[PDB]
């Protein structure tokens, strides 16, 4: 009997009254439209935006912490080399804005050096991420922005084939150029090659080298696309699982362990993978929201009073829209809790508070690599956790409005079934 239960659950009675009233339903639908703009159209105040940003920064920060300590080398086939030095620019090396891969003889592989092939994949994802962070991530709804990205690396040493025609696609090693396209979006890549003799004016380094420049145009900077880059970054590290060994500064904070394999940071890597996974799911709710717009008013028809049992075919879409917004908000929260040092323990807590959430650059804008970036995240991790929490606190009203819209729609889906 229904009186007997509206006795105890008086808020259920209010819910039913609202579900029978077009003007309460239309108010809830307006609320959903405004909260959707907060979630997918804003930046500072969107918890969804802040959580995407945080997932990306944690991946980037992870490599800023460990990249300088990571062995790499060999030749183009993932094979060992006799005397190859390959240097990647705008990377966070030891007292340097480049990372040098020059470990010879050892076979690239697990607990060994990272192959140049893996490093190239890693490096490209990194350069793209840092260029986009530097320019500022767009709101979640902006799906067609692009960024331009340029990066360089060099090869020296006898037998080094990492800058050759097969590695590169480029015909003349001195002065040649090649263009190729790729993917929903077309990205153009221009690769050019130049040789610099040991004697040339300039040329600190005693030695002859080849320089490769890559210029990518039309790189998508949408959230979904940047998350895919962050995933490539962290998965390449975890799959390649190269040897590292760290310089622990006398004084400083202490990195444990000091030698080992990169995939040995298992809690850190799992956490970051899980953040990215949750942010990809979060960004997927965008299309659910878009395809179920709530801006058309609803009512009875032919001037007949509204009948909640027959006139409510919109409810399904309203519920899917409300549920999707709630899901964004919960996943945004869950990204934050995965990395927030307040709920972390032991070695993983030390990693985040001592390294990942710090920056040693002498704030520098996001995406800047200096000779002091190494061993620190330099990716605004702490500021982003704070801004995520601030944005969630400023979403108190909208969250209740979303729950209410969901309860209304769900009451109407029930009545119509």
């Amino acid at each position, epitope marked *: 009997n229904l009186s007997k239960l509206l006795t105890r659950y*008086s*808020t259920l009675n*209010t*819910l039913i009254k*609202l579900s029978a009233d077009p003007s309460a339903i239309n108010a809830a639908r307006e609320n959903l439209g405004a909260s959707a703009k907060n979630l997918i159209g804003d930046t500072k105040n969107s918890p969804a935006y802040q959580a995407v940003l945080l997932a990306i920064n944690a991946a980037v920060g992870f490599w800023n912490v460990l990249g300088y300590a990571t062995q790499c080398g060999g030749n183009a086939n993932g094979q060992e080399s006799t005397s190859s030095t390959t240097i990647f620019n705008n990377e966070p090396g030891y007292r340097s804005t480049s990372i040098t891969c020059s470990l010879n003889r050892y076979k690239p592989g697990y607990y060994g050096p990272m192959s140049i092939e893996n490093f190239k994949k890693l490096n490209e994802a990194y350069q793209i991420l840092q260029t986009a962070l530097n320019k500022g991530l767009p709101a979640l709804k902006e799906n067609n922005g692009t960024v331009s990205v340029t990066y360089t690396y060099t090869c020296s040493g006898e037998g080094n084939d990492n800058c050759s025609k097969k590695a590169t696609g480029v015909s003349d090693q001195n002065g040649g150029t090649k263009t190729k396209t790729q993917t929903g979006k077309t990205v153009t890549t221009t690769i050019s090659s130049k040789v610099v003799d040991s004697q040339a004016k300039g040329n600190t380094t005693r030695v002859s080298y080849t320089e490769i420049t890559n210029k990518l145009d039309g790189v998508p900077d949408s959230a979904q696309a940047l998350l895919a880059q962050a995933s490539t970054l962290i998965n390449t590290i975890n799959t390649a699982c190269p040897y590292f060994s760290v310089t622990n500064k006398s004084g400083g904070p202490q990195m444990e362990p000091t030698r080992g394999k990169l995939c040995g940071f298992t809690e850190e890597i799992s956490a970051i993978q899980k953040m990215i996974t949750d942010a990809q799911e979060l960004v997927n709710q965008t299309s659910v929201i878009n395809e179920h717009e709530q801006s058309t008013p609803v009512g009875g028809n032919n001037g007949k009073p509204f009948n909640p049992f027959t006139d409510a075919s919109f409810a399904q879409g309203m519920l899917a829209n409300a549920s999707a917004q*709630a899901k964004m*908000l*919960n996943l945004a*929260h869950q990204v934050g*809790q995965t990395i*927030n040092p*307040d*709920n972390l323990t032991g070695t993983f807590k030390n990693f985040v508070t001592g390294f990942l959430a710090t920056c040693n650059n002498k704030g520098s804008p996001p995406g800047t690599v200096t000779t002091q970036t190494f061993a620190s995240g330099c990716a605004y991790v702490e500021q982003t956790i*704070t801004n995520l*929490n*601030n944005s*969630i*606190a*400023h*979403f*108190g*009203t909208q*969250e*209740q409005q979303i*729950q*209410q819209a969901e309860n209304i729609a769900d009451t109407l889906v029930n009545f119509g079934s």
Partner: nanobody
Amino acid sequence: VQLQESGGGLVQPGGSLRLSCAASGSIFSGNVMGWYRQAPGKLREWVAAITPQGVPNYADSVKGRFTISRDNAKNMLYLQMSSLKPEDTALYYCNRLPNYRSWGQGTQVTVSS
């Protein structure tokens, strides 16, 4: 997984009251926390929130009259209410934001002359 409000009662307009909420660690720690209320004939309304670092914000209906605070060592959330009005009469609840989906009992506040 526990939310326990207390401190409510019947007071006079113009009056004061301080509400308490004991929350479990897993709800409270490193989360935004907040207060809500449910008045007769209405659904639950958000009232105030506070970040782990202590930054408070408020709904317009209570701003300048209520103060939310938190005690991170004891997992306690507080709402100091002043210049109370009949319209502040309601069941008050605390939760994290976003909400854990089981609400506690709440605590009744009645303001009446």
